[model samples]
Target: EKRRDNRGRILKTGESQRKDGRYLYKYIDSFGEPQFVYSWKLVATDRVPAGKRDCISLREKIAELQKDIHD
Candidate 1:
């Protein structure tokens, strides 16, 4: 399932929010349940602990690569 904004921007990526703003996207799963969600700020790598840097950077790189490929 997917959700988009008024301008046609994708608002969710997997189980996470894709933008730095306050908004809600809700729906029920295949099992028939309700869920609501939103995303706050998009944190920076330096804002996270050093030990977590590699994982964060890897995810960001993957997202960037995916965007490049899609574009």
Candidate 2:
């Protein structure tokens, strides 16, 4: 069984949504320290609400880091 977000989407390991509506993706780096990437949107197509700092979505950042890890 897997965890589901408030919207009922399955949450992948290390992926979570905070009460404040921001999404978080936790990762372990080469240095073995836990790190986090946060965004207001979960995917690239999701919109950033007004008055928020626009940035890359959570999933995109996760994929980019995974790509680097395989190198």
Candidate 3:
């Protein structure tokens, strides 16, 4: 059986409740990097809506090293 939080949300997925009075949205970026976004419970729940994912797909290329680019 699946366990749910007080908000009746499923608990096993990436979304998790934090002890700091917040919720977290966890996902991995395309470059195989982990990304975490947090918000006060309600905000996170709305951002990471159930049955849908909202991710900013970002990619990289070794661009010409401009004098002001590498920081």
Scored against the true structure, residue 58 in model 2 reaches a CA lDDT of 74
* Pairs with backbone N, CA or C atoms under 3 Å apart (clashes), candidate 1: none
Q: Against the hidden reference, what TM-scores do the models get? A: 0.27, 0.77, 0.43
Say which prediction, candidate 2 or candidate 3, comes out ahead on TM-score.
2
Model 1 lowest lDDT segment of ten = 39-48
Task: State model 2's lDDT.
Answer: 0.80
Candidate 3 yields a Cα-based lDDT of 0.46
| lDDT tens readout by residue for model 3, 4-70 | 7657766556666766535655554445566666544343224444544553211111111222244
Candidate 2 deviant stretches above 4 angstroms: none
Could you give the candidate ranking by TM-score, starting with the highest?
2, 3, 1
Highest lDDT scorer: 2
Worst 10 residues of 2 by lDDT: 62-71
* Superposition TM-score, candidate 3 onto the true structure: 0.43
lDDT of 2 by residue, 1-71 (tens): 78988777676787889898788888876677888888888878877779887888878887788668645
